[PDB]
Each structure stands twice: as structure tokens, then as C-alpha cells.
Amino acid sequence: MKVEIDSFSGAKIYPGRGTLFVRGDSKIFRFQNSKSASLFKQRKNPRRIAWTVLFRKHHKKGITEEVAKKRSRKTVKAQRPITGASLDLIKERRSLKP
Amino acid sequence: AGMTTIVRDLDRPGSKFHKREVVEAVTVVDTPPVVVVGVVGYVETPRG
Amino acid sequence: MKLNISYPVNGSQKTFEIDDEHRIRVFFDKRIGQEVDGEAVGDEFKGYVFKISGGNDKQGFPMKQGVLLPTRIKLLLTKNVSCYRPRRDGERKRKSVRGAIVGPDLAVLALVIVKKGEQELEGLTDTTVPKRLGPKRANNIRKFFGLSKEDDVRDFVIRREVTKGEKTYTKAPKIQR
Amino acid sequence: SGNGAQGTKFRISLGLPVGAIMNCADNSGARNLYIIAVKGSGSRLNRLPAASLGDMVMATVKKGKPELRKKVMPAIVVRQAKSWRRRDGVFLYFEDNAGVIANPKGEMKGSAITGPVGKECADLWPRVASNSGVVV
Amino acid sequence: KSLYTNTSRKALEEVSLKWIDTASKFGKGRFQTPAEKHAFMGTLKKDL
RNA sequence: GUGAACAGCCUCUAGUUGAUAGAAUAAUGUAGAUAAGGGAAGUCGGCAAAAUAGAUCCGUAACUUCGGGAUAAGGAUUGGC
RNA sequence: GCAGUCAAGCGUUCAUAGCGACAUUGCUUUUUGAUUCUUCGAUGUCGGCUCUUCCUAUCAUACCGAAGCAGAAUUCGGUAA
RNA sequence: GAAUGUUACCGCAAUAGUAAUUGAACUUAGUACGAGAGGAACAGUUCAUUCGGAUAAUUGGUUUUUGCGGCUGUCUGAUCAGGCAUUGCCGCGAAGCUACCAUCCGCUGGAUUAUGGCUGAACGCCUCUAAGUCAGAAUCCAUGCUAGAACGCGGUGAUUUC
RNA sequence: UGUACAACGGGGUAUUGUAAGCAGUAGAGUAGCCUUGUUGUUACGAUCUGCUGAGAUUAAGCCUUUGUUGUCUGAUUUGU
Ligand SMILES: [Mg+2]
Ligand SMILES: [Mg+2]
Ligand SMILES: [Mg+2]
Ligand SMILES: [Mg+2]
Ligand SMILES: [Mg+2]
Ligand SMILES: [Mg+2]
Ligand SMILES: [Mg+2]
Ligand SMILES: [Mg+2]
Ligand SMILES: [Mg+2]
Ligand SMILES: [Mg+2]
Ligand SMILES: [Mg+2]
Ligand SMILES: [Mg+2]
Ligand SMILES: [Mg+2]
Ligand SMILES: [Mg+2]
Ligand SMILES: [Mg+2]
Ligand SMILES: [Mg+2]
Ligand SMILES: [Mg+2]
Ligand SMILES: [Mg+2]
Ligand SMILES: [Mg+2]
Ligand SMILES: [Mg+2]
Ligand SMILES: [Mg+2]
Ligand SMILES: [Mg+2]
Ligand SMILES: [Mg+2]
Ligand SMILES: [Mg+2]
Ligand SMILES: [Mg+2]
Ligand SMILES: [Mg+2]
Ligand SMILES: [Mg+2]
Ligand SMILES: [Mg+2]
Ligand SMILES: [Mg+2]
Ligand SMILES: [Mg+2]
Ligand SMILES: [Mg+2]
Ligand SMILES: [Mg+2]
Ligand SMILES: [Mg+2]
Ligand SMILES: [Mg+2]
Ligand SMILES: [Mg+2]
Ligand SMILES: [Mg+2]
Ligand SMILES: [Mg+2]
Ligand SMILES: [Mg+2]
Ligand SMILES: [Mg+2]
Ligand SMILES: [Mg+2]
Ligand SMILES: [Mg+2]
Ligand SMILES: [Mg+2]
Ligand SMILES: [Mg+2]
Ligand SMILES: [Mg+2]
Ligand SMILES: [Mg+2]
Ligand SMILES: [Mg+2]
Ligand SMILES: [Mg+2]
Ligand SMILES: [Mg+2]
Ligand SMILES: [Mg+2]
Ligand SMILES: [Mg+2]
Ligand SMILES: [Mg+2]
Ligand SMILES: [Mg+2]
Ligand SMILES: [Mg+2]
Ligand SMILES: [Mg+2]
Ligand SMILES: [Mg+2]
Ligand SMILES: [Mg+2]
Ligand SMILES: [Mg+2]
Ligand SMILES: [Mg+2]
Ligand SMILES: [Mg+2]
Ligand SMILES: [Mg+2]
Ligand SMILES: [Mg+2]
């Protein structure tokens, strides 16, 4: 079971729900309701219809703490040396000086 | 009560939809326990 | 689906299989780069954090960082981009590409252990494989030993042994710059 | 359906009653197909027989090569438009009605099929599958 | 209870649901739960 | 006022607000509308209905009594500021 | 219009698998005639549309018997509306 | 719907009605049969046609939800907000209604017809028939399904004091 | 006289598509006064943006409710 999403509005389309349009050039559109589906046929542009995901994305509506930072990074520092040279005499010659 | 939709795999060897999901309508009837308050006993007669 | 897991600290890798829709499910709708805790996927991995780095679906088509989408699309690729090696200067090809968002269609998820769980994963944390090559350019030899331009590299250059039946040869790089 | 169709077809909404004209989808020379009958269809006083996706009709060519005109021949519906509903739950419709001219066996007169093809037809008619680009 | 012991295959199949729809029947339901609806929509001028 | 306009539609002056009434909204009607896909297969017959339409620009066949046919056909455009 | 009886013939052979001349016995009342009994102080024509029901001399569908039924196809017949 | 003491609840079942239809594909099987060309069927499986009874989760249609928005013309000094244009017009539109345009459901026993048989005399033989009997059809009777006799009926509750 | 009932109100569920108000270095631009501009200043401008997936409507045969206010003996008739 896959939840699809609305080509025009970007709403979740739970199973058997709204309608599916296969356009002239084998591009497949999915509407969750005759609303999105009329607006689509009307040649309306999703990015100008305010309630659409697409519109809100474009107009940066209510995203807030997705621009908030995080705490994601590693902590490594481990030697393996060089394959073929005996990784024994690679730490006792690894004593630096400054 | 009402109706809703179901999604389930189908077990039907031979069918084009064997082992595939189908969506199906269903009804739901509210069914609290029934309470037993009487017994009634019938006898057979040549009149029913 | 296969998980292809790397422990870049050790240089190790081993694959793991999973036949559990619910365990598998955890990776769904996540993207490349997003981190994933362990206990869900398996009790082996309790603790372990995985960074999702890519992977293939059936039909074998690779994922591609950046696309978003949980489907497959055909893109026009160039030089210096993943999933395409140009045959000819100025060549660009149109090519199918799998999206970056994980879904049940993937044959293999490519994970990369970012930090270690409460327990060891056999062929991974318990085995370690050394870098093939050593520093070749003069100052890289300096920094890989912290040396200051005084110590003279010539003897700090790494040396790899090799036997000729009853002769053992020793060959170093060739410093440069 | 029928002769030359290996497999069955789960019922799909009829969209093309007799008199429907559908786009001809192959490269046989024919530009359109006028439906005069539907195969294996039954009978009720006053009902038009009607085709659905993957049905074999009997048609004539209203527009196209003169060698293709003025005769009845078999053809197969490959795109519908009237929305119909698969067992997986979806109501889906194409953007045009269209079929490809064929022989009783179900073999295609032409060799390519322009545009998409519905699966339920693909599944039903091997040589229609062959000459398909995008199915569904 | 049925009056006969059907064998039908259709009868006998042992179904096992995968998903029960639970969005609003009072219109074009877009959401199973108020939780899901919160997820998708974000904070509203009411809310916290 | 709009508009080509003594058109339609709204308005001032003047004049009416008269036409049994109340409560419901079954069937069948009369009068007014709409319908997915197909598109005259309906019918004696496209009956009924639908479609078209203003203005500016472009473009306009047969044939002809040379006056026409002609808004032939076919197209684009049209608000606000 | 439909169905019989006799059986000379047809059917390579073979009357009657399937048919069937000359004759001849019938049934039917959606043919057409023949009649003129009812209605001329009126019982609204032809066809179509719609809708019910009925008959069987059965086209299909169920189960059968026969064949000049190898099979497949078909033909003849029965119980059947 | 009067009257059969009243009123209420639960039931019986006389009689009447009654319903399911047809096809294909797979498999059997390139099998049986056949020199060959060709070429079946029963059991099993998946679908379909015609019909019927419902239903409205989904999709579609309907729109006076005159619910939200848009538009023209005018009128209320402007604004806000509105009135009028026999529902002014347009896009969307819940709810209800609704469509093989949508979904779901349509039972299994007996007795028989034709016909093929058993045993078996008439007629020492022979015969499915005379006695007796087996098997048997989209038929028939029931099962099931709809009414429920307003002059068919049962079980049960409570039955008025100014 | 109570898990009562209703009318409101609240919350949910829906529908539409971002209200009025205010503000703005957004705006083809335009006026007016000078102290004639080293954003000169004061206001006007279809539309745009922000507060604002807002505002409106939402049982009339949607769901729910610890809130508010209210209501809770009129009439007729029946017996073996
Ligand atoms: Mg619609
Ligand atoms: Mg709708
Ligand atoms: Mg060098
Ligand atoms: Mg073409
Ligand atoms: Mg007719
Ligand atoms: Mg022509
Ligand atoms: Mg080919
Ligand atoms: Mg609803
Ligand atoms: Mg007067
Ligand atoms: Mg009058
Ligand atoms: Mg009245
Ligand atoms: Mg229509
Ligand atoms: Mg047309
Ligand atoms: Mg005609
Ligand atoms: Mg025509
Ligand atoms: Mg006709
Ligand atoms: Mg005529
Ligand atoms: Mg005629
Ligand atoms: Mg007319
Ligand atoms: Mg129209
Ligand atoms: Mg002309
Ligand atoms: Mg302009
Ligand atoms: Mg003779
Ligand atoms: Mg003979
Ligand atoms: Mg002879
Ligand atoms: Mg006759
Ligand atoms: Mg007379
Ligand atoms: Mg007479
Ligand atoms: Mg007369
Ligand atoms: Mg008379
Ligand atoms: Mg008269
Ligand atoms: Mg009369
Ligand atoms: Mg008979
Ligand atoms: Mg028989
Ligand atoms: Mg013979
Ligand atoms: Mg009958
Ligand atoms: Mg009879
Ligand atoms: Mg009868
Ligand atoms: Mg009395
Ligand atoms: Mg085979
Ligand atoms: Mg032979
Ligand atoms: Mg029938
Ligand atoms: Mg309005
Ligand atoms: Mg203002
Ligand atoms: Mg008027
Ligand atoms: Mg509706
Ligand atoms: Mg039906
Ligand atoms: Mg039944
Ligand atoms: Mg039964
Ligand atoms: Mg019986
Ligand atoms: Mg015997
Ligand atoms: Mg017998
Ligand atoms: Mg007898
Ligand atoms: Mg006898
Ligand atoms: Mg039967
Ligand atoms: Mg009674
Ligand atoms: Mg009684
Ligand atoms: Mg009150
Ligand atoms: Mg806003
Ligand atoms: Mg009502
Ligand atoms: Mg309150």
C-alpha cells in the first residue's frame, strides 16, 4: 500500500481516492479530489493557488524550525597505516617532533 | 453505523489479482453485548 | 532488502539482509544523509546510527543525492556528477535515475555506520583493513607525521615489502614537489 | 474479446458505444476508427453495444488511406477516457479514445502504437503488448 | 448464521486486513488522525 | 446610467404594492435548469434542445443578370489601471 | 399454413438413416376467400413506441433416443414454453 | 380503519407470490478418434452476458448549503457592507438524492418426465412391464425468500375505585 | 427531576481560498509647495506583500459537550 500525492496540490492520496489521469504524452497526473482536478483542467497554476503545498513552499510559508540547526557530526581519529608496509613500524616512526 | 474502505492482499489462485492488494467497501454495525432475559419453548403440531 | 553498511573509521564493510516489513519500514521516507537510530532495524544494531548514503532499486538504477522524489526519473547528466561517466569531452547523456527518498522498491540500501552501538557487528567492528597507499607528495608526508621543513622526508616515506621467492624487495613511492 | 485472447478481462466501464469514433493508434495508414460492433457483447432491447479498454470491436476507417476505407475490420481498444475502476482501487481515465486495427486472431495490421496503452489490454493481447511504448 | 455450509473458495478465504480507512466521511477526508493532520499542516493560528 | 440605441437590465419624479389564505414538499405534471463517456446509434424527420452571436483587425470559394453571392467559410483580439 | 396412411421411387448396394410419386385421411384459424348474424341516435384505421400475459407447430439453453454418428461438425426424433 | 373485554410485547403459518440466466478463457489436451487434414468432453480454475434485490466507503452527476470566492450593470454621497437583474452570471462546493457511470449479494433437498435399466411372467423360449423395482431433466414439491387471512391462531406483560 | 430534554455557547469535522483593519524602501506612475534636493519633502496610485491556510460558513437528516439559560400533570377514552 502506497500513499500517493496530488500532482496539483500535493495532498496525500490514501488508497482508492481521487482520480488518475494519463495524459496524451504518458505523463500520469494524480488528483485527490475534483477540486484539484478542475483547477488542473482549468490550466490553473499551483504556485498561484494559495492553499497548495507548492504555493506555500514557493512563498516560504510556515517552515520555521526546518531552518533551525542540529547536532550531526562524527568523531573518528584512527590509524590503519599503509597496505604492504608493516603497520607495526608505523607508530614508532610516528612520534613527530613539533 | 456506517461504511468505510479496506485494503488487503487477495488469496485467489488463478485470479489476475492473486497476491495483490484490492480495495473493498465494508459496513460497520455497532454491536454491544446483547442481554438475555427470557426463554420461549415451541412444540410441533399438525398446524405448525 | 540488502543494507550495505560501511564503518569508515575501520575501513570495513559487510552486507546485511532484512525480511521484515516493519523493521525495513523505518528507512522509508528518509532521504540520503538523514540519520537513523538502530534498535528499530535490529537488536544487533541497538545504539548504532546509520547515515543513508544511497543505493540501487531492482532494475539496478542508482539513487542520486539531491533529486528528492521517491520515484525514478530520467535526467540530463554531465561531467562531475554521480551516476554518469562521460565517454567524450562535452558529452552529456539522458539517463534514468532513482530518487533519493527510500522506498520498498530498493534492492539495496547503502548505509554508513556513523557511530557504534552497544555491541560489535562481526565482520565490521571486529575486522580492520589498512589504506592501500601512503603519502607521496613531499608535504603530505610531512603532515602525515607532523614534521616541520627540517626533518628531510627521504626516510619517512613508507616502504612496502614483497617477496621474490627467496628475495624480499622493498619499494617506496617517489616524492614530488 | 474472445478468439486469440488468452486470458480474461475483469469488467471495466463501457465508454464507447456503437457510433463512437476513436483515434487510430498505430501506423497502418488509418487516422480514425468508427465502431460498428463489440465482440461477445450481449443483447437488451434498445441498448447500444459498447466497447471498453481491450475490447475487440468491428470498425471501419472514416479517415485514412483509401485502401483502408470502405470495409469493416476488427480492431482493439487501447485507450478509453471514460473513467473506470481497477481492483486496486483507482478510478483512471485517458485523454482520448483509441484503438488499433487488428485481425480476428488479434494480430496487428501495423507495427507501432503511438501513445500509451492500458495494461488491461496489454495483458490481454500479446502483439499489442509488443508494439507498446508506455503501458498505463 | 448462514443456513448452509458454503465452500465457494470466495467463502473459505481467510482475509487479513492491511488498512482500514478512517478519514472523515463528512467530506473529502485527507487525514486518518488528528495527529497526522497536525504533522502535515503545522501550527495553526489556534493551537498552542 | 450602461450601451449604437425610444433595446434589455438598475434608477428619480408620479403611481402601485390590487390577483383567497395557512401548512407541507409524495407520485404524475406545467414552467425553469444541469449532467460522466459516447455523439443522432433516437425519430417519418435532429421534433425539442444545444451550439453561434457584439465590436476592432485579418482572411474569404463555386457561380453571377457584374449589382452580388458575403457577417461566405476561417481566424485573432476585447478587463482594470 | 401445418401433420399423417399406402410405398413405386430417391439414397453407389439398400422402400422407410434422411426422403418420398400416384393416391388418400386429417388438423389449424396470424392467409385469402365465401356469408351478412351483431353494431350506421358511431365499439376512434395502418405502423411504430411502451408494457403485461398467454399458446407451442421449440430458434437457443437442460437431459435424452437415432443416423448413410470415426473425430469435429450436422441432421432426425422425445421429455420440454 | 369500526367491532371480537382493554392495552402491550413476542411469535405461529393457511393461502397467495417467488428467480435466477447464458457465454468464454485456462486446464483437461494438440489428448481420446483419425491414413491424414483436423480434433472433443466430464472434474477443477478464472472471468463475463442478460436478469434481480439492495447499497452510497470510494468515483462520477445534481446545487437555493444561495456555503466560500470571482464578474458585469445599476442603486445606497465615499469606505465598510449591501439591494435589484422571475435563482443576474462564473469557478469550487459539503449533505442528501443517485449510476452496470459506482460497490456489494442472489440458497439446497426430495420427487418425477423422456430415456436407459434391474428382476420377471404372460407365451417352459424371449422380453425394462403385466406385479414389483434402479437411475434419471433449464420440469415439479419443498428448503429459502416476500405478504400475512384486516371474520385463522399461540405464548406473555400490565390491566383504571371518587 | 436525569447519563433528562431543549435553545445557545465551546471543541471536532467539513466548504472556500487568505477577511475587515493597519502597515510597507513593493507599484506602470502622477500631482502640489518650496529651502530646487548630494533617498527633498507632503500626500494620491490598478495591483502587490505582512499580520493571515486567514475570514466566513459548518445540521437545517454531521460528531461531541462537566459551560449558560430554560422546560418537566393540558385534553380525551377504554372492562372480561
Ligand atoms: Mg465535478
Ligand atoms: Mg463532486
Ligand atoms: Mg614534480
Ligand atoms: Mg498517427
Ligand atoms: Mg428501439
Ligand atoms: Mg470524403
Ligand atoms: Mg514488433
Ligand atoms: Mg460524505
Ligand atoms: Mg393610474
Ligand atoms: Mg385569480
Ligand atoms: Mg396555497
Ligand atoms: Mg452527456
Ligand atoms: Mg463531436
Ligand atoms: Mg437513423
Ligand atoms: Mg455522423
Ligand atoms: Mg430505429
Ligand atoms: Mg419523411
Ligand atoms: Mg424512414
Ligand atoms: Mg428547432
Ligand atoms: Mg455547454
Ligand atoms: Mg454559401
Ligand atoms: Mg490590454
Ligand atoms: Mg404405389
Ligand atoms: Mg438401408
Ligand atoms: Mg432400388
Ligand atoms: Mg398464416
Ligand atoms: Mg345484418
Ligand atoms: Mg361483416
Ligand atoms: Mg356503425
Ligand atoms: Mg350505437
Ligand atoms: Mg363513442
Ligand atoms: Mg372503447
Ligand atoms: Mg410439444
Ligand atoms: Mg428421450
Ligand atoms: Mg449404410
Ligand atoms: Mg415462460
Ligand atoms: Mg403449459
Ligand atoms: Mg404455463
Ligand atoms: Mg362492549
Ligand atoms: Mg495447449
Ligand atoms: Mg478415415
Ligand atoms: Mg434472461
Ligand atoms: Mg456570491
Ligand atoms: Mg480603505
Ligand atoms: Mg423586469
Ligand atoms: Mg454529492
Ligand atoms: Mg444491477
Ligand atoms: Mg434464496
Ligand atoms: Mg437452504
Ligand atoms: Mg417431496
Ligand atoms: Mg435383463
Ligand atoms: Mg420405465
Ligand atoms: Mg407401469
Ligand atoms: Mg404385457
Ligand atoms: Mg434452476
Ligand atoms: Mg391478522
Ligand atoms: Mg392473537
Ligand atoms: Mg427550552
Ligand atoms: Mg495569508
Ligand atoms: Mg425532510
Ligand atoms: Mg461555554
User: How far apart are the first and last residues' alpha carbons of chain B, in Å?
Assistant: 37 Å
Alpha carbon gyration radius of chain B:
22 Å
Helix amount of chain B: under 10%
Major sheet strand order of chain C? 2-1-7-4-3
**Largest interface (C-beta under 8 Å):** A-C, 20 and 26 residues
Q: Would you report the number of β strands of chain C? A: 9
Global Rg of chain C:
22 Å
User: In this structure, how is the largest beta sheet of chain C organized?
Assistant: 5 strands, mixed
Q: What is the helix/strand order of chain C?
A: EEHEEEEEHHEE
Tell the overall outline of chain B.
Answer: elongated
Look at the helices and sheets of chain C and give the structural class.
Answer: mainly beta
Ligands (ions, cofactors included): magnesium ion
Task: Return the domain count of chain C.
Answer: 1
Number of helices of chain B: 0
The H/E string of chain B reads EE
Q: What is the structural class of chain B?
A: mainly beta
Quaternary: part of a larger assembly
Individual helix count of chain C: 3
Overall 3D geometry of chain C?
extended
According to DSSP, the number of beta strands of chain B is 2
Write the layout of secondary structure elements.
The structure is cut from a larger assembly and holds 1 copy of chain A (98 residues), 2 copies of chain B (48 residues), 1 copy of chain C (177 residues) and 1 copy of chain D (136 residues).
Chain B: E1 2-9, E2 21-28
Antiparallel strand pairs in B: 1-2
Chain C: E1 2-7, E2 12-17, H1 21-25, E3 35-36, E4 49-57, E5 72-77, E6 93-98, E7 106-115, H2 122-125, H3 138-143, E8 160-164, E9 167-171
Parallel strand pairs in C: 1-7
Antiparallel strand pairs in C: 1-2, 3-4, 4-7, 5-6, 8-9
Chain D: E1 16-17, E2 21-24, E3 32-38, E4 50-51, E5 56-60, E6 73-79, E7 84-85, E8 91-94, E9 98-101, H1 119-122, H2 126-130
Parallel strand pairs in D: 2-9
Antiparallel strand pairs in D: 1-4, 2-3, 3-5, 5-6, 6-9, 7-8
The structure holds magnesium ion (61 copies).
The structure holds 4 RNA strands.
Subcellular location (chain E): Cytoplasm
Family (chain E): Belongs to the universal ribosomal protein uL3 family.
Organism (chain E): Saccharomyces cerevisiae (strain ATCC 204508 / S288c) (Baker's yeast)
